[PDB]
Amino acid sequence: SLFLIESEPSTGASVSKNLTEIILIFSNDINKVSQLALTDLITDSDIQGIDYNIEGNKVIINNFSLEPTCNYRLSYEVIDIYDNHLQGYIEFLVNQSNYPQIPDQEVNHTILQAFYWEMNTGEYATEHPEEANLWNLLAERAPELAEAGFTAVWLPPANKGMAGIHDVGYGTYDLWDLGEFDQKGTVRTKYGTKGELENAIDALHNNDIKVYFDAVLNHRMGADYAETVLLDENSRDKPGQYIKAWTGFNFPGRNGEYSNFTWNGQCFDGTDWDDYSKESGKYLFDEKSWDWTYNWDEDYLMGADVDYENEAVQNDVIDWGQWIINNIDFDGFRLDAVKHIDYRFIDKWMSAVQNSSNRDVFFVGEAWVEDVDDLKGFLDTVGNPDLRVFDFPLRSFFVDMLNGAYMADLRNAGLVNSPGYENRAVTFVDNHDTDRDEGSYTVSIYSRKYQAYAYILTRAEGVPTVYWKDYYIWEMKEGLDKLLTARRYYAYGPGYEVDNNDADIYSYVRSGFPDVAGDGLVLMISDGTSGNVAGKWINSRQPDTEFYDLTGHIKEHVTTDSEGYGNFKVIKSEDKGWSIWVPVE
Numbered sequence: 002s003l004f005l006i007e008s009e010p011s012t013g014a015s016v017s018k019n020l021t022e023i024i025l026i027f028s029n030d031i032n033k034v035s036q037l038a039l040t041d042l043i044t045d046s047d048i049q050g051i052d053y054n055i056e057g058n059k060v061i062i063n064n065f066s067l068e069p070t071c072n073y074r075l076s077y078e079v080i081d082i083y084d085n086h087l088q089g090y091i092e093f094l095v096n097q098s099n100y101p102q103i104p105d106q107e108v109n110h111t112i113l114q115a116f117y118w119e120m121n122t123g124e125y126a127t128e129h130p131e132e133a134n135l136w137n138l139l140a141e142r143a144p145e146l147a148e149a150g151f152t153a154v155w156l157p158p159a160n161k162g163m164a165g166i167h168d169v170g171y172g173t174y175d176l177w178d179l180g181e182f183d184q185k186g187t188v189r190t191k192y193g194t195k196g197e198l199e200n201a202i203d204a205l206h207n208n209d210i211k212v213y214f215d216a217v218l219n220h221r222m223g224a225d226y227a228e229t230v231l232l233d234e235n236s237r238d239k240p241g242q243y244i245k246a247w248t249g250f251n252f253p254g255r256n257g258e259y260s261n262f263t264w265n266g267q268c269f270d271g272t273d274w275d276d277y278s279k280e281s282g283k284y285l286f287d288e289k290s291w292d293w294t295y296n297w298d299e300d301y302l303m304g305a306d307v308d309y310e311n312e313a314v315q316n317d318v319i320d321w322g323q324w325i326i327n328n329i330d331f332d333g334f335r336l337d338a339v340k341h342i343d344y345r346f347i348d349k350w351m352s353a354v355q356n357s358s359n360r361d362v363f364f365v366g367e368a369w370v371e372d373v374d375d376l377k378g379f380l381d382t383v384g385n386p387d388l389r390v391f392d393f394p395l396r397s398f399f400v401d402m403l404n405g406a407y408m409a410d411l412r413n414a415g416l417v418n419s420p421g422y423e424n425r426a427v428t429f430v431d432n433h434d435t436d437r438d439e440g441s442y443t444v445s446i447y448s449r450k451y452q453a454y455a456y457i458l459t460r461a462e463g464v465p466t467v468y469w470k471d472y473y474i475w476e477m478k479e480g481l482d483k484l485l486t487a488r489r490y491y492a493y494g495p496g497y498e499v500d501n502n503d504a505d506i507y508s509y510v511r512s513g514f515p516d517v518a519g520d521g522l523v524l525m526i527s528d529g530t531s532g533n534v535a536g537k538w539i540n541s542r543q544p545d546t547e548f549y550d551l552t553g554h555i556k557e558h559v560t561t562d563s564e565g566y567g568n569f570k571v572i573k574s575e576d577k578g579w580s581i582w583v584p585v586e
C-alpha cells in the first residue's frame with residue numbers, strides 16, 4: 002500500500018524560517034509528483050516557484066522563502082511505481098524571528114526538575130545512555146536549556162546515599178560527601194563525582210541558569226554501626242525495651258574533611274527498625290521527644306529520624322547549608338519532606354543560610370498537602386517569608402481533569418490562586434513521586450498534560466517547574482518548547498480572568514507590558530473531546546491587534562476590535578486542546 006511513512010518537518014511542527022527543504026518519505030518508490038502546492042493558509046496563497054526532486058521513495062521540496070509566524074500547508078498528489086495514487090498534506094507553523102524585547106531583569110523564571118526515579122535503570126539505561134553521567138549531561142545541555150527558557154535547574158540530591166551508586170538520593174547517608182569520598186561502595190554518586198558536579202554548576206552559571214540542591218534533612222540511613230538504645234516509656238512500640246538501632250555515623254571514608262561531626266543515638270529521636278528482633282515499628286528513644294511539626298506526630302517518616310532539638314545537630318546542618326551556597330555555589334534548595342521536620346528548625350536554618358550571603362537564596366519546600374487551606378496553614382506555621390512550597394493543591398485539579406473537570410474552576414484552583422500566597426507557589430504537573438513506573442504514590446497526569454503545562458507556564462503568579470521525564474523521556478519537548486516560548490517572550494504584564502469560562506473551556510489573558518511592543522497572550526485550554534473547534538469572545542486588552550496561535554493548532558488569525566475583543570479558538574480534544582494566541586507583530 003502507498004502511504005506517507007514520515008516527513009521532515011512532521012505535520013504540526015514549528016520550524017525556523019531558515020528551513021530550506023521539506024522531505025516526504027513514502028512507503029513505495031515514487032514515479033511522479035502529479036500535484037504540489039505550498040500554501041500560506043492565512044492569505045490563502047500558493048507560493049510560486051517551488052521545486053521538487055524524487056529520490057526513490059523520498060520527495061524533497063524546496064525553493065521557497067518561509068515567512069515568520071505563518072501557517073503553511075504542503076499538499077501533494079503522488080503516483081508510485083505500481084500506479085497507486087495518493088493525495089495528502091502536511092501542515093507546519095514558522096517561528097517568530099523578531100520576539101518582544103523583555104528587559105533581562107523582568108524575564109520570567111522557569112525551573113527544570115532535572116531528574117526522574119528510573120534514570121539509568123532498566124530500559125532507560127539502554128535507551129538514554131547519556132543519563133549514566135547526569136552532571137556531565139547537564140553541563141553539555143546548559144546552552145540548550147537556556148535557549149529553551151529555563152532559568153533554574155533542580156538537581157536530585159547530590160550527596161552520598163545509603164544505596165551508593167544506586168541511590169536516587171533520598172536515602173541520605175552523608176550530606177558532606179558530594180561524590181568525593183569512598184563511602185557506600187562508590188566514590189561517585191549515581192549522578193557523578195563532586196568535580197563533575199562543580200563543572201555542571203559552572204557551565205549552568207555560564208548560561209545564566211541557577212542551580213538548586215535537593216536537601217534531605219529529615220533522616221539518615223546506612224549507618225556505619227548500630228547501638229543499643231533504650232526506648233522511652235512514651236514509645237508507641239516497645240516502650241521501655243532495648244533495641245539495636247542503626248544510629249552510628251562516623252563517615253570513615255571522609256575522615257573528617259569539611260566537618261568533624263559524628264552522629265550517634267543522641268542525635269536521633271527514633272527509628273523504625275530493631276536489629277535484635279528484626280521487627281519494624283515506630284520507636285522513640287529514651288528521653289527524646291518528636292519534634293514540633295505542623296500536623297501532630299508527623300516528625301517520624303523513615304530511617305533514623307534526626308533530632309532537631311539537639312543543638313550540635315542543628316549547628317552541623319546549618320554549617321552544611323551555608324557550605325552548599327557559599328562554597329559549592331548553589332543558588333537555593335528544595336527541602337524534601339518539609340512537613341516532617343521541626344518547623345522551628347526549618348525557619349532557623351533558612352534564615353541562617355539566607356543571612357550568610359548577599360545572594361538571595363531560593364527555598365521551596367515539599368509539603369505534600371492537597372488542600373489549599375492546609376498548605377496556607379503550614380506556611381503560616383513555619384512563618385519564614387522566604388519559604389515557597391510545591392502547589393500540590395493545584396495538581397489535584399489536574400488529576401480531576403483526567404476524566405473531566407469543571408474547567409471554569411481553574412480561576413480559583415491551587416495555592417497559586419490564594420490571595421496573599423500566590424507568589425509562594427511553585428507550580429508543577431508531575432514529579433518523581435507522582436509519575437513513576439512502579440510504586441507511584443498517586444496517578445500521573447497521563448492525559449491533558451499539555452493543558453496543565455500551558456496553565457502553569459502562562460500564569461502571572463508562581464514559579465513553574467517542568468519535569469525532565471515529560472520533556473526528554475515521554476518526548477513532549479516539541480510541544481513544551483512552544484509553551485516555553487510563550488512564557489519566555491509573551492507571558493508578561495497583568496493577568497486577567499474572563500467571564501465566559503464553562504465546564505469545558507478555561508481562558509486567561511496576559512496583557513503584556515505597556516512599554517514592550519508585541520508581548521501578551523490569550524490562553525485557551527479545554528477538557529472537551531468532541532473534536533470540534535470552539536470559540537470564545539475575549540478581551541485581550543490589546544485593541545486592533547492581530548494574533549496567531551503559536552501552538553500550530555488553529556490555522557487562523559484573530560484580529561481584535563477597537564475595545565480589544567476577539568473570537569479566540571481552541572480544538573476540543575485531549576491531544577490538541579490548548580491554544581496560545583500571541584501578537585503577530
Ligand SMILES: C[C@H]1O[C@H](O[C@H]2[C@H](O)[C@@H](O)[C@@H](O[C@@H]3C(CO)=C[C@H](N[C@H]4[C@H](O)[C@@H](O)[C@@H](O[C@H]5[C@H](O)[C@@H](O)[C@@H](O[C@@H]6C(CO)=C[C@H](N[C@H]7[C@H](O)[C@@H](O)[C@@H](O[C@H]8[C@H](O)[C@@H](O)[C@@H](O[C@H]9[C@H](O)[C@@H](O)[C@H](O)O[C@@H]9CO)O[C@@H]8CO)O[C@@H]7C)[C@H](O)[C@H]6O)O[C@@H]5CO)O[C@@H]4C)[C@H](O)[C@H]3O)O[C@@H]2CO)[C@H](O)[C@@H](O)[C@@H]1O
Nearest residue numbers: 171172222223224247274303304338369370371372434442
Ligand atoms: C545490611 C545493612 O545494614 C545496615 O542498614 C540498616 C540501615 O542503616 C538502617 O537505616 C535501616 O534501614 C531501613 C531500611 C533498610 O532497607 C528501609 C526503610 N527505609 C526504606 C523506606 O521504607 C522505603 O519506602 C524506601 O524509601 C524511599 C521512598 O520509597 C522513595 O519514594 C523516596 O522517598 C522520598 C522521600 C524520603 O526522603 C520524601 C519525599 N516525598 C514524600 C513526602 O515528603 C511525604 O510527606 C509522603 O507524602 C505523603 C503525604 O505526607 C500524605 O499525606 C499522603 O498525601 C495525601 C495528602 O496529604 C492529602 O491532602 C491528599 O488528599 O491525599 C494524599 C495522598 O497522596 O501521601 C503522600 C504520599 O505517600 O511521602 C512522599 C513520597 C521525596 O520526594 C521522596 O522521593 O526515597 C526513599 C528513600 O530511598 O526506601 C527506604 C530505604 C527503613 O525506614 C530504614 O530505617 O535498617 C538497615 C538494616 O535493615 C547498615 O547500615 C548497612 O551498612 C548494611 O548494608
Ligand SMILES: C[C@H]1O[C@H](O[C@H]2[C@H](O)[C@@H](O)[C@@H](O[C@H]3[C@H](O)[C@@H](O)[C@H](O)O[C@@H]3CO)O[C@@H]2CO)[C@H](O)[C@@H](O)[C@@H]1N[C@H]1C=C(CO)[C@@H](O)[C@H](O)[C@H]1O
Nearest residue numbers: 436437444445446447448449450451471475477575576577
Ligand atoms: C505520552 C504520555 O507520556 C506520559 O504518560 C505515561 C504515564 O505518565 C505513565 O504512568 C504510563 O501511563 C499509564 C498509566 O500509568 C495508567 O494509569 C493508564 O491506565 O495507562 C497508561 C498507559 O501506559 O505511561 C505513559 C506513557 O506511555 C505522560 O504522563 C502523559 O501525559 C503523556 N501524554 C501527553 C501526550 C500526548 C500525545 O500527544 C497527549 O495526547 C496527552 O493528552 C498528553 O497528556
Ligand SMILES: OC[C@H]1O[C@H](O)[C@H](O)[C@@H](O)[C@@H]1O
Nearest residue numbers: 225226227228249251263265
Ligand atoms: O564511635 C565509633 C565506634 O564506636 C563503637 O563502639 C562502634 O561499635 C564502632 O563500630 C565505632 O567505630
Ligand SMILES: OC[C@H]1O[C@H](O)[C@H](O)[C@@H](O)[C@@H]1O
Nearest residue numbers: 290291292293294296297298
Ligand atoms: O507538633 C507536632 C507534635 O507532634 C509530636 O507529638 C511532638 O512531640 C509534639 O510536641 C509536637 O507538637
Ligand SMILES: [Ca+2]
Nearest residue numbers: 300301341342
Ligand atoms: Ca522528622
Ligand SMILES: [Ca+2]
Nearest residue numbers: 290292308310
Ligand atoms: Ca526531638
Ligand SMILES: [Ca+2]
Nearest residue numbers: 406504505528
Ligand atoms: Ca469539563
Ligand SMILES: [Ca+2]
Nearest residue numbers: 513514517520
Ligand atoms: Ca505590550
Ligand code: NA
Nearest residue numbers: 270292307308
Ligand atoms: Na525528630
